[PDB]
Design a protein around this ligand. Sequence first.
Ligand SMILES: [Mg+2]
Ligand SMILES: [Mg+2]
Ligand SMILES: [Mg+2]
Ligand SMILES: [Mg+2]
Ligand SMILES: [Mg+2]
Ligand SMILES: [Mg+2]
Ligand SMILES: [Mg+2]
Ligand SMILES: [Mg+2]
Ligand SMILES: [Mg+2]
Ligand SMILES: [Mg+2]
Ligand SMILES: [Mg+2]
Ligand SMILES: [Mg+2]
Ligand SMILES: [Mg+2]
Ligand SMILES: [Mg+2]
Ligand SMILES: [Mg+2]
Ligand SMILES: [Mg+2]
Ligand SMILES: [Mg+2]
Ligand SMILES: [Mg+2]
Ligand SMILES: [Mg+2]
Ligand SMILES: [Mg+2]
Ligand SMILES: [Mg+2]
Ligand SMILES: [Mg+2]
Ligand SMILES: [Mg+2]
Ligand SMILES: [Mg+2]
Ligand SMILES: [Mg+2]
Ligand SMILES: [Mg+2]
Ligand SMILES: [Mg+2]
Ligand SMILES: [Mg+2]
Ligand SMILES: [Mg+2]
Ligand SMILES: [Mg+2]
Ligand SMILES: [Mg+2]
Lengths: 106, 151, 98, 96, 127, 206
Amino acid sequence: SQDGTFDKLTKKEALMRTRELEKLENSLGGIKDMGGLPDALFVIDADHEHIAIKEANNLGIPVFAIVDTNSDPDGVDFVIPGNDDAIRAVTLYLGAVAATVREGRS
Amino acid sequence: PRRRVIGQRKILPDPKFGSELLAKFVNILMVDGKKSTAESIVYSALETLAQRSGKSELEAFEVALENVRPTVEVKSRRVGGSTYQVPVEVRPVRRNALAMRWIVEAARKRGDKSMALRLANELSDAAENKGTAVKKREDVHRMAEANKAFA
Amino acid sequence: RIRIRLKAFDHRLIDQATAEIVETAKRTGAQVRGPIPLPTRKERFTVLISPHVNKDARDQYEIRTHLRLVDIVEPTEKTVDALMRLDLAAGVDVQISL
Amino acid sequence: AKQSMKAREVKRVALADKYFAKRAELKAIISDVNARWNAVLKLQTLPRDSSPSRQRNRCRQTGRPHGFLRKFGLSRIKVREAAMRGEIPGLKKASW
Amino acid sequence: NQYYGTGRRKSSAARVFIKPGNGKIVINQRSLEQYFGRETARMVVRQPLELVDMVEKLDLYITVKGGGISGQAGAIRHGITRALMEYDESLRSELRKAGFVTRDARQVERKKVGLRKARRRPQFSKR
Amino acid sequence: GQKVHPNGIRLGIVKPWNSTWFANTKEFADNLDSDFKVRQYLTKELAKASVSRIVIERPAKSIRVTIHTARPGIVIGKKGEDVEKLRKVVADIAGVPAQINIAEVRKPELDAKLVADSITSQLERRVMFRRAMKRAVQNAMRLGAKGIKVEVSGRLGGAEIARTEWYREGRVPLHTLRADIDYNTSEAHTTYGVIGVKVWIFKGEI
RNA sequence: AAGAACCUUACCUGGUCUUGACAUCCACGGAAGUUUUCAGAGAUGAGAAUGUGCCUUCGGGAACCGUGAGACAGGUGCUGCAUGGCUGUCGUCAGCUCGUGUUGUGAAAUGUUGGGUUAAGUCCCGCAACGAGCGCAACCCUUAUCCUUUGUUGCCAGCGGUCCGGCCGGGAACUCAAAGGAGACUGCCAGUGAUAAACUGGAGGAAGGUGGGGAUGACGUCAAGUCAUCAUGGCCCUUACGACCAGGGCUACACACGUGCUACAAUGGCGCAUACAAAGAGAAGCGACCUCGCGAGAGCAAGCGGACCUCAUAAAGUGCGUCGUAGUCCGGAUUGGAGUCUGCAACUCGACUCCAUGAAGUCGGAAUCGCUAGUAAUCGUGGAUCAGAAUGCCACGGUGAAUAC
Ligand SMILES: [Mg+2]
Ligand SMILES: [Mg+2]
Ligand SMILES: [Mg+2]
Ligand SMILES: [Mg+2]
Ligand SMILES: [Mg+2]
Ligand SMILES: [Mg+2]
Ligand SMILES: [Mg+2]
Ligand SMILES: [Mg+2]
Ligand SMILES: [Mg+2]
Ligand SMILES: [Mg+2]
Ligand SMILES: [Mg+2]
Ligand SMILES: [Mg+2]
Ligand SMILES: [Mg+2]
Ligand SMILES: [Mg+2]
Ligand SMILES: [Mg+2]
Ligand SMILES: [Mg+2]
Ligand SMILES: [Mg+2]
Ligand SMILES: [Mg+2]
Ligand SMILES: [Mg+2]
Ligand SMILES: [Mg+2]
Ligand SMILES: [Mg+2]
Ligand SMILES: [Mg+2]
Ligand SMILES: [Mg+2]
Ligand SMILES: [Mg+2]
Ligand SMILES: [Mg+2]
Ligand SMILES: [Mg+2]
Ligand SMILES: [Mg+2]
Ligand SMILES: [Mg+2]
Ligand SMILES: [Mg+2]
Ligand SMILES: [Mg+2]
Ligand SMILES: [Mg+2]
């Protein structure tokens, strides 16, 4: 995108490459630099991310979830009853979890 | 015709009179791909028509056509599980195309000597509403009236 | 003055062979009058591809014969002496006569 | 293809080039309008295989009589299978 | 001076030369009237000149080979319109609407194997 | 049968010709027959030498004859003994002075012809056909060969009903004209009849 | 089957041969070869002349010919329901699958379904699926425009004079030839579309939306076709199911079907005059010119391995004249006589020429076929096979439509 072949060949092939690139970026982004299976999952919603929870359970990876009243526990190792729709509430969860993980090995 | 509505192919005007309409007529009269023979025949027929009926070539041709142009024709609908023959209005371009075809067909079956005479007789009596082509038009029209119940 | 006509089955091989003759003549003398393509022959064949019946099933082949002519007009001795023994031929035919 | 047939063809070619192409004087030169006598026409006791118009022109490899091509000396099918592998210089699949 | 145009149509190739003189016509060392003057496609050569009025203001000398009457006439017409650029590109605008500059590429189709001629297929029977 | 020869269809685009001499109609047939006569003799004589192909050219009243082989050592014997014998016999058959060249082929398992000869040789030795093909496919992909593809056919394993059971790995774009597809065939002569073998090998796209 | 008088040719009737027509080996004899006579339909038997070419510690030799025994040779004989290879077909239809993941006890499903869109499993978006392969498309050949290079045997615009013929100096313009490049990519504008894919229209352009045509034929189906092109398992015959020869047949003829050519005419027949192509072939070949013949052709004899010479005058067409709707100045079958060639040989059984003869046929029921544009229709030209022989096959151009609501 910056150093290799991005301008050569027709503009049509340039634009398809870019739109294909952003397709990969927004589909699988931060996960790019993982290089292995994780050690834990954090899900904002349980009944909306059931596929991810099920895959984690299949592989024996701990799962921490914010479960709403409509959601289903028993796929989650650590349930957190709380609204998962409100923007203010979800930010609160992400901030608190973000803060506690800022403190790494110290 | 299943999918694409198509445009139209143009033709050159008549060299004598620069009429697309007459060029199509000679082109309909053409057989085996001999345009020179066709244009020769029509020119001989129309000049004979002009001196017969005075006036001029174009209006002599127009009066012949307007007497044989059909306004409505019958068509097979077959929608209700039955053979219905419904009337449908004819388009302008198709209207004159049928006329020219009928005129040529009628002239072809006449019994005069030269085809040029056959056209002259047909185009003349067509202006007088007694040619075979005129008979076909009214035959088509009356069939449409008989089946007017469907529409 | 001296006519050389080359023929072969591929144009990328005829071209270099003639280009070799024209340049050697040009450097060993003057003018060198120029190669000209002139028409090429297309010989077609048609053969039934089945071992039995099936008349409509057949394929068509052709052989293209490319022909070139140089017609050097210089009788220079340094040119005629070097002109022969310059074949570099891998399936290209030569005629020397005028 | 019945190399007994192939034996017959080679024998005819041997006779044809042995007698004719030099006894052609007997046929053409003498049976002419010199201005006759049927003696020359009468002398046609040759083996009857010396006539060049008795060779069937079979395929070199397989030897079938039909589907021959002079340019290649092979039948249609042998031409095809050799062409696709190379062998015949310059042959391609034509289109236009 | 004189202007040139090539023109081509259906196996026919033409050579057209334009001069600013009277309205004389000569085709292949003959007259249009004598070449195809009154026979088929007589005015086809005139069409590029009926628009942008001629009267008697252009000398035309041409030579054509290949094809047949209609082809050679069509080849000429393409030459006339292509060499009629004398009046710069201004007259080309209405020349397009006439539809003359566009070279007509409508060659004859080859005859394929199994077909009788090009697209005509041999008669067929089912039972 | 509804597939074009992948060699012939490429014969002008990417695949070179296998005979590059020129001749007029007068001697075209004679040259062609001589080539065939030469080729069948060499391939029969060098049966154990694993010859990939024979390229014959006749530049300026001669015959070159280049032999592409995977084991030139025994093709040439010691110094030039056996190769001279081939050259002498070839010149006799063709009726003209003859030379002979040897071209070693690297990666013998990447050559379509050689692979087929190996499979048919094993098959005549009563190797189970499934393992012979799988071995050929896998050890070819191991060395480049984007598209190995092999196919046996006809009375497999001494059955009563014939069948094909081909395998492929990689990609083999037979419909792209500039794909460097190396294709060749061979046949075994087992006690149960004839078994045919076809192998396609893909390489760079140009 | 891209071409049965002999041959081809296998098939029939006769005349013949048996390690053989075709191949290797062993032993013996002989150069090989060439010219002639008799009997026979011939194959084959009987003879007569002539030649004796290269090697040789020489039981012998090499290319070649006869004699004897063997292993053998031979089969277009059966089995495409044992096979390879090759081919048709659905169908150039857009589909057919796999790895991992997931769902179901399992056969299996998903992906490959859904909303749009496309010629297309083409693409966009969504989606327990994530990717990939064979297909589609593109890369290949040809055609349509332009530029550069060289200009013959190709070309002749500006110049000089000419037998008015590029013919002649000359020219490198032009047509053209054949190599290398440019070009077309929804690229640019407008509108619609979820603001995506894409669709409709417009400019420019020779060409506009995969510009036209071709090659290209997925996994598989039909125990589809080919043992007779070839190869090949098994079986079968081996003084015969093998081999040679002459003649005959494959060309028969109460009939039934398929594919075609010519017609039934005045958009025409006939006579005279006259204009415009493309693409091919040629050395056992194509065969100018000139003379002879009413003609097919014959005699003499240039040129050409061919942008040079030959095949080779294109015909429809256009001008005049005649025919005047008749079984005709339409139609040409059939038949008698006379000929030209190829061929050892035209009875069975060739093509073509001259004179004479002049059937059916007046547009064809039920039914049914091809074709969407340089297409149908119509008119000519060439090539393979080939001594000789197309109304078939494969190619080329001329004129050139109707209609898709
Ligand atoms: Mg030629
Ligand atoms: Mg055999
Ligand atoms: Mg013959
Ligand atoms: Mg045509
Ligand atoms: Mg195919
Ligand atoms: Mg016989
Ligand atoms: Mg016979
Ligand atoms: Mg017998
Ligand atoms: Mg089968
Ligand atoms: Mg079939
Ligand atoms: Mg499971
Ligand atoms: Mg599917
Ligand atoms: Mg499925
Ligand atoms: Mg869909
Ligand atoms: Mg796809
Ligand atoms: Mg999907
Ligand atoms: Mg002058
Ligand atoms: Mg547009
Ligand atoms: Mg494709
Ligand atoms: Mg069967
Ligand atoms: Mg059968
Ligand atoms: Mg059989
Ligand atoms: Mg028959
Ligand atoms: Mg008559
Ligand atoms: Mg007569
Ligand atoms: Mg009658
Ligand atoms: Mg009548
Ligand atoms: Mg269509
Ligand atoms: Mg025709
Ligand atoms: Mg010929
Ligand atoms: Mg012939």
